[PDB]
Amino acid sequence: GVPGQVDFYARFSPSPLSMKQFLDFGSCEKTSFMFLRQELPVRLANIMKEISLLPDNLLRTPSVQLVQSWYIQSLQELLDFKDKSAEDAKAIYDFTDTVIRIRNRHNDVIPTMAQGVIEYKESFDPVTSQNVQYFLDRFYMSRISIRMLLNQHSLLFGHIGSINPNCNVLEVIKDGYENARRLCDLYYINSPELELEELNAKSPGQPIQVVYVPSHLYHMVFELFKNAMRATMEHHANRGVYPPIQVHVTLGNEDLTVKMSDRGGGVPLRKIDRLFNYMYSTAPRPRVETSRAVPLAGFGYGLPISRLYAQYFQGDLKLYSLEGYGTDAVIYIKALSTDSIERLPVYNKAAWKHYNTNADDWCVP
Amino acid sequence: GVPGQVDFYARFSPSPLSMKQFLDFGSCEKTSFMFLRQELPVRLANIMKEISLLPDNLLRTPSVQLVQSWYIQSLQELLDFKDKSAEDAKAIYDFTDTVIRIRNRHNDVIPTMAQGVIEYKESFDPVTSQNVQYFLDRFYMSRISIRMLLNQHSLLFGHIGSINPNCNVLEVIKDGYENARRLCDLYYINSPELELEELNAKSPGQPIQVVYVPSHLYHMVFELFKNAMRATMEHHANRGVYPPIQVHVTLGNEDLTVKMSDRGGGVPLRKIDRLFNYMYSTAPRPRVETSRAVPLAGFGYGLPISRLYAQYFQGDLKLYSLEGYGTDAVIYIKALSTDSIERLPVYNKAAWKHYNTNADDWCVP
Numbered sequence A, B: 001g002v003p004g005q006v007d008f009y010a011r012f013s014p015s016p017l018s019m020k021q022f023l024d025f026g027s028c029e030k031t032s033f034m035f036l037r038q039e040l041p042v043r044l045a046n047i048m049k050e051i052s053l054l055p056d057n058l059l060r061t062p063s064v065q066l067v068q069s070w071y072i073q074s075l076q077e078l079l080d081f082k083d084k085s086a087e088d089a090k091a092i093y094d095f096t097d098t099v100i101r102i103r104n105r106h107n108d109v110i111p112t113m114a115q116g117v118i119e120y121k122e123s124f125d126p127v128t129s130q131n132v133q134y135f136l137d138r139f140y141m142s143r144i145s146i147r148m149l150l151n152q153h154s155l156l157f158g159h160i161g162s163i164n165p166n167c168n169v170l171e172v173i174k175d176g177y178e179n180a181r182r183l184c185d186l187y188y189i190n191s192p193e194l195e196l197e198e199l200n201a202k203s204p205g206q207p208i209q210v211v212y213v214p215s216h217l218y219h220m221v222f223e224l225f226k227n228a229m230r231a232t233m234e235h236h237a238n239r240g241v242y243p244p245i246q247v248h249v250t251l252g253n254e255d256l257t258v259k260m261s262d263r264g265g266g267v268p269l270r271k272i273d274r275l276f277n278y279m280y281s282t283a284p285r286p287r288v289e290t291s292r293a294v295p296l297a298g299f300g301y302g303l304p305i306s307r308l309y310a311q312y313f314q315g316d317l318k319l320y321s322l323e324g325y326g327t328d329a330v331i332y333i334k335a336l337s338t339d340s341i342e343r344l345p346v347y348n349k350a351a352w353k354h355y356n357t358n359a360d361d362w363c364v365p
């Protein structure tokens, strides 16, 4: 029934698009329909197979069950169009209406899945916890890709969709800074200043722009600023003098890089990857019923999701920290829209084996 | 015959020692004998199995054949002692003489193996080239461990051996700098200055010392200085004004970190790992018959081997670069001798499968 549909579409591989293709298209509703009536079921079905491989106590949570029920409903609604005619205009219109409805239904997928993990952790493992980390990177990257497709179609047929062909990088950074700073001031009653430096090596003294999704770049920098500010305010709390956060932006031949440096006291190498681990960073949401300021770290996986945003278009986000001193966080983005290609998970025997496999070739410490 | 001996000892796992154990021992010749007459054959045999799995055209090179013949001879010499009595003093003395002879025989193992790779590359693949990278990290880490054991026994029975319980970090750094600078001046007729900063967070204003092998730390910093200087001199060659190399040393609760920052123009993320790839960085040795200065990059795998030295005692060495601007290289060393444990490769079914195995669970870009 539903298993059959899921199995049919999960056999296919998702088809990644480049940023250039997203843009080239946006700057024909029927062409989009033709692509999406296959691609959306494919992307939904591939990730739904891995939802089914979760630890039973996680899968059974009401939050995960709800997310799964959304996916099942959206899959079914999309599959109503497989036999319809590209040339029948109502079919087109209802596809567009169905894209909008799904987009709304799935609006809160990220925090709902995160609440699922809280419910799991709250009520109940180190073995299957590797399975949880593997799944959530893939589930959230999948969701980022699905949301991209839904946003493009909805914006175009309901700036090129959500893509800005001339994204002003330093402007987005300063927006990130100001909104993070506001939260810092609310929690710590003080905040570090920003020192911002740029180098357009590609062509010196010219504005730094790239083809990008500004909200993706904003999410990354806003989350890193929160992380930098927290460490700085907690580290220097005794002194009452707070070193600024230093941001250096470089546009190279191939890489746009954003380095964010703080003097927040750092983290030893053994622990620093914890910032990207879902289970370690799984914390209950603050209660609504308080006027007490919201902390700069906690619920909602800002950092692991920031890194997924960077990697989604073949970029990356790396942290390195000097324990006792401070931390540098580096966002790497492809300078060229032709190098910016969707990074998409696929369900197959290799994915399955990852849930179902585990002496090493190095000695144990 | 020889296969039998190798197979017997390769069944065992090497036994990693902590820096504390190396030191605790050094600060009884018979105890060392008891340990080493088993451990050295074990370490030799485990790596000899992987030499046999090399691509045939690499294994067949005269350099690899020579290295392999050294290992076979040393294994045989060590195995002459298995039945001898810990209490018979000649047995002890000849073991010590045999340790010294092997140490000398194996003095040039690193460049001889590297010449093997030149011969292979010179005379003849992308598939087996992953096998080459896997092998050489393991072979060279193995060799680092074998040399450590031989040095300790030879120094003690022929500073605690080669270990300095109070290694003066900034002193070693400045030695590294001055020797790199000398080579820079010879090649580029100019060199960047050093700006050195330290923070003993653990106890402020006190000298930074750790229990360490100073020659290991020297190798790492000297190689990184060469790398930083090359990039700086090539990048700013038109300007004729050379930004200094900035070194920040931090001692934290757990990590000693050495950050080395240059303004050498950086490398895009796609390419930066090439600096650790044996096949990419395999270049013919300069000829002896010239007075022309030796380049700061080239033969002998300074960088991948520096990283092995860091990882050998549970540290690490990482590079991150901002393309168009410059690069930070970070050495991480365990501050505590009890956390400093040998990282040793072991031959078993998992190692073998690595030579003999290769759809992905992510989409192809």
Ligand SMILES: [K+]
Pocket (backbone or CB within 6 Å): A010, A011, A012, A013, A014, A046, A346, A347, A348
């Ligand atoms: K599939």
Ligand SMILES: [K+]
Pocket (backbone or CB within 6 Å): B010, B011, B012, B013, B014, B046, B346, B347, B348
């Ligand atoms: K073994």
